[PDB]
């Protein structure tokens, strides 16, 4: 799947820590332009009865930060890998997640063969996937094994038509790595529903390594409820796994009286704007 879909009004985060109230403020920062297009990368059982390769986890350019969204009821999505090398020459970043914990490890990951996969790849019969994650082989010189409270907190889905939506923004500038996160329990029947919501800053990890590639780590043993097609370009379908690229834009934000961003307008989309 390589379709294209419009991102209506998403991708705004608090520029700075200072509190403000009831002020219209203009800022110039990296942002996701309104009404831009985003691709749908997909995970599917490509002949899941056999160990047939799926190629659902490709490598992307990472041009000046990445926007990310995911709309699923399970914990299938867990972990990202970054780096310009992913080799033995230079370090690599791992943001793998535990059951109720996260560990961030910048270290030299020499060989990453492939995500682990159960040959049966059926979750309609067995629902347990236990301790089957080993991707890195040789851990050479490295430090900064940051540990804290888990990024994701499981918003339980029940009664149907009600699942959590996760939004993330990854930036790496001037030796500082910033991850803005937001959980929206309300998604209803739309994968990318209309509405305005800010992105909460969560962590600030000093590393300082230049990033030019990234890849996503899926629980590739099985991922159910997955349509797929061989189409490319401007098409239609479903992938439940998005991505977007930021640009150096200028925004105007309307802080509420309590101190929460309510509306925003970009100064480059429309003459009226």
């Amino acid at each position: 799947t390589q379709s294209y879909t419009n991102s209506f009004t998403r991708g705004v985060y608090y520029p700075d820590k200072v509190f403000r109230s009831s002020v219209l403020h203009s800022t110039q920062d990296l942002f996701l332009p309104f009404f831009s297009n985003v691709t749908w990368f997909h995970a599917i059982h490509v002949s899941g009865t056999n160990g047939t390769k799926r190629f659902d986890n490709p490598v992307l350019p990472f041009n000046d930060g990445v926007y990310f969204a995911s709309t699923e009821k399970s914990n299938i999505i867990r972990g990202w890998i970054f780096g310009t090398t992913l080799d033995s020459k230079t370090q690599s970043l791992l943001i793998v997640n535990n059951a109720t914990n996260v560990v961030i490890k910048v270290c030299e990951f020499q060989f990453c063969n492939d995500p682990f996969l159960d040959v049966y790849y059926h979750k309609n019969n067995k629902s347990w996937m236990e301790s089957e994650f080993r991707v890195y082989s040789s851990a050479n010189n490295c430090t900064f094994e940051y540990v804290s409270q888990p990024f994701l907190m499981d918003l339980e889905g029940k009664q149907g038509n009600f699942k959590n939506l996760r939004e993330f923004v990854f930036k790496n500038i001037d030796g500082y790595f910033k991850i803005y996160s937001k959980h929206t329990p309300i998604n209803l029947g739309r994968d990318l529903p209309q509405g305005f919501s800010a992105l909460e800053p969560l962590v600030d990890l000093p590393i300082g390594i230049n990033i030019t590639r990234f890849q996503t780590l899926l629980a590739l043993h099985r991922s159910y409820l997955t349509p797929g097609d061989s189409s490319s370009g401007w098409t239609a379908g479903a992938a439940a796994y998005y991505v977007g690229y930021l640009q150096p834009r200028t925004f105007l934000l309307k802080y509420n009286e309590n101190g929460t961003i309510t509306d925003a307008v970009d100064c480059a989309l429309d003459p009226l704007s």
Partner: protein, 49 residues
């Protein structure tokens, strides 16, 4: 003096709903309005003499 932020005035408790990540308070003309105590977790209004 708070964390290296010199100032002068009167300090009084105020009902400012500061979010956990938000630390300083500010308004028009880059004027500091509230500060966060380096030891206790309290937010207080600052008013010039």
């Amino acid at each position: 003096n708070f964390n290296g932020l010199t100032g002068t005035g009167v300090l009084t408790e105020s009902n400012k709903k500061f979010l956990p990540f938000q630390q300083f308070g500010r308004d028009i003309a880059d004027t500091t309005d509230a500060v966060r105590d380096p030891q206790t977790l309290e937010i207080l209004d600052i008013t010039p003499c």
